[PDB]
């Protein structure tokens with residue numbers, strides 16, 4: 739059902755896909771430590787933002803590690819190529835970590851934006867529902883990336899309607915609330931939004947690889963696209979978020995941050 743099941747892979751394609759997944763594990767658990775240590779230097783207000791970054795690091799690192807073992811459990815090097823043995827690998831388990839990390843990524847954005855009370859719970863409910871609708875409709879489409887490519891596009895179309903609306907809600911809250919942020923972070927948050935528009939858009943590109951590159955090098959490209967998009971949406975993003983949390987904690991008079 740996923741194009742990965744359709745192809746044999748050379749030794750170089752297979753251990754490259756393997757090396758991308760194990761490397762992502764190391765990067766995510768290496769940033770987990772960093773997000774853990776620096777949390778003390780964040781005021782109680784924004785401290786949850788760094789904990790969320792710790793959550794997504796482990797959430798992603800566990801799925802990447804799981805994708806790696808499954809990758810090496812499903813294929814066997816036979817007669818000069820790694821051939822599918824049993825059916826254990828699938829991208830579907832990437833969509834199940836998005837359901838969890840995306841709300842965490844989104845929640846820590848509203849926290850640094852200094853939203854609170856009725857607006858925090860309200861804005862968070864519409865963003866998560868929009869996200870979940872985006873991920874769910876996207877999961878239904880990739881189920882046909884091999885069988886029905888027409889269903890892939892229309893489900894990706896419905897998923898894009900949610901993606902666009904979600905971005906519009908994030909962008910609107912960003913520009914209407916940055917004047918409240920401290921330490922000059924009103925300039926930094928804008929760039930994070932642009933970083934967001936960039937890293938998040940790589941996923942639909944990877945989602946469409948089966949449509950314009952249906953072969954073994956397309957599977958390699960998709961993982962590469964995932965890896966690049968996955969470090970920028972979670973690691974770099976979480977790094978930009980922590981800096982803002984620290985900076986505002988200093989401007990607000992929190993010594994450990996100062």
Ligand SMILES: *C\C=C(C)/C=C/C=C(C)/C=C/C1=C(C)CCCC1(C)C
Nearest residue numbers: 876894897898901938941942945971
């Ligand atoms: C790991 C972090 C994130 C933010 C994953 C994000 C995924 C998307 C933004 C996926 C979007 C899709 C769209 C817009 C339409 C095609 C199907 C996708 C689910 C890949």
Ligand SMILES: CCCCCCCC/C=C\CCCCCCCC(=O)O
Nearest residue numbers: 760763764767768771803806807810
């Ligand atoms: C203070 C140092 C912090 C260390 C950060 C790096 C942590 C990485 C931990 C282990 C990475 C390897 C796990 C993946 C196992 C191989 C996957 C496989 O091919 O089956």
Ligand SMILES: CCCCCCCC/C=C\CCCCCCCC(=O)O
Nearest residue numbers: 782783786854858859862863866867
């Ligand atoms: C059912 C899913 C949609 C519901 C919306 C979720 C609302 C998220 C609200 C907060 C989650 C956990 C606490 C984080 C807020 C910190 C408050 C603070 O530090 O001032």
Ligand SMILES: CCCCCCCC/C=C\CCCCCCCC(=O)O
Nearest residue numbers: 866867868869870871872874875878
């Ligand atoms: C327990 C909460 C889990 C997430 C579900 C709630 C989020 C609702 C989001 C939008 C509804 C879109 C559902 C459409 C699914 C159609 C695909 C199908 O059923 O075949």
Ligand SMILES: [Cl-]
Nearest residue numbers: 798832964968
């Ligand atoms: Cl990912």
